[PDB]
Amino acid sequence: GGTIARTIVLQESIGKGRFGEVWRGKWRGEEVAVKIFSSREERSWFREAEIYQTVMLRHENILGFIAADNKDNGTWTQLWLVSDYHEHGSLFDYLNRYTVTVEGMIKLALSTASGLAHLHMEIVGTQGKPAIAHRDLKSKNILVKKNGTCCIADLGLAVRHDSATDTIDIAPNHRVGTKRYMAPEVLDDSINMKHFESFKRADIYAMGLVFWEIARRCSIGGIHEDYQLPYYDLVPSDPSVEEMRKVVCEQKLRPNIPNRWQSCEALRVMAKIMRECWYANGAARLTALRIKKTLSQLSQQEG
Ligand SMILES: COc1cc(Nc2cc(Oc3cc(C)c(C)nc3-c3ccccn3)ccn2)cc(OC)c1OC
């Protein structure tokens, strides 16, 4: 019989994502994470399975994928994905619970950037890894490991690019992700989806917002900000595309950068990265690799 789902015991409900539902389970004397889909959610199950099985995808800052499988209880079939389990949960949860040191901030930011750089980067060869854009990067889709570093998850909306033929593997729809984190060009539909760089640039804008969430929680001399989502001060809790568009495209506002961040070199560098992720024109934004290089340079200097 099968070696995966058949041999796993579910222990704890984690919650519902975009599709399916997450659980903590036990496999071969080890805790694992399981995402369970119904039969009518096969398209979303297969697609996430497909992205995670991409050659050369594994990276310390991407969720470690174990397997896709199904399980029959005798009445209905469940479609399963199985991965590493991370006890701390999402970066959103982590930042609500805790403040971080300067070192902690740099580890969380650098690990996020490194994960995104890996997704984004095409690797040549027989084991040819295409460039991959996430399309729904947010603090709730980044997990925090026990070592205080991040890994990116929720790859079901991702798109993959073949540079030789300049083709994307699926036909992309507009505005598929979380409205709050959508780039200006996504919000106003001006994004050119026949230009794969556009998807990478939209991811970068979203990472900038995530960086802002982290920096708020960096505590120096006991001084820090409360946890907030980006645009907490300007839109409703579950904002529409029009509400986001009015703030981000028309009024041209971005999350507020405190002046107390000027007083610290680490926060000064992070603040600069955010601004350079937040330009309305995606072509002006930093790349994930450049951000990784900068934070790696900063990480060396700090400790
Ligand atoms: C204890 O509270 C939380 C724990 C975790 N841990 C966790 C969750 C995971 O979920 C996934 C599992 C699988 C197999 C796949 C394909 N994806 C995910 C996933 C994770 C995040 C976003 C989207 N998909 C994987 C590893 N560790 C997570 C929590 O929230 C996300 C917790 O708080 C509810």
Second rung of CATH, namely the architecture of the largest domain: Orthogonal Bundle
CATH class of the largest domain: Mainly Alpha
Cα end-to-end separation: 50 Å
Strand order in the largest sheet: 1-2-3-5-4
| Distinct bound molecules | the ligand COc1cc(Nc2cc(Oc3cc(C)c(C)nc3-c3ccccn3)ccn2)cc(OC)c1OC
Rg on CA atoms, Å: 19 Å
The computed structural class is alpha+beta
Quaternary: monomer
Largest sheet report? 5 strands, antiparallel
Total helical segments: 8
Query: Per DSSP, what share of the residues sits in E-state strands of 2 or more residues?
Result: 15-25%
**Count of structural domains:** 2
CATH topology category name of the largest domain = Transferase(Phosphotransferase), domain 1
CATH superfamily of the largest domain: Transferase(Phosphotransferase) domain 1
Number of E-state strands: 10
Helix percent reads: 25-40%
Any idea what the shape is?
A: globular
Catalytic activity: L-threonyl-[receptor-protein] + ATP = O-phospho-L-threonyl-[receptor-protein] + ADP + H(+); L-seryl-[receptor-protein] + ATP = O-phospho-L-seryl-[receptor-protein] + ADP + H(+)
Domain Protein kinase: 8-298
Main location: membrane
Cofactor: Mg(2+); Mn(2+)
Write the layout of secondary structure elements.
Layout lengths: L7 E9 L4 E7 L3 E7 L4 H11 L12 E8 L4 E7 L7 H7 L4 H19 L10 E3 L8 E3 L5 E3 L6 E4 L4 E2 L15 H4 L8 H21 L24 H10 L14 H13 L10 H15 L1
The structure holds the ligand COc1cc(Nc2cc(Oc3cc(C)c(C)nc3-c3ccccn3)ccn2)cc(OC)c1OC.
GO molecular function: activin binding; activin receptor activity, type I; ATP binding; I-SMAD binding; metal ion binding; protein kinase activity; protein serine/threonine kinase activity; SMAD binding
EC number: 2.7.11.30
Cofactor: Mg(2+); Mn(2+)
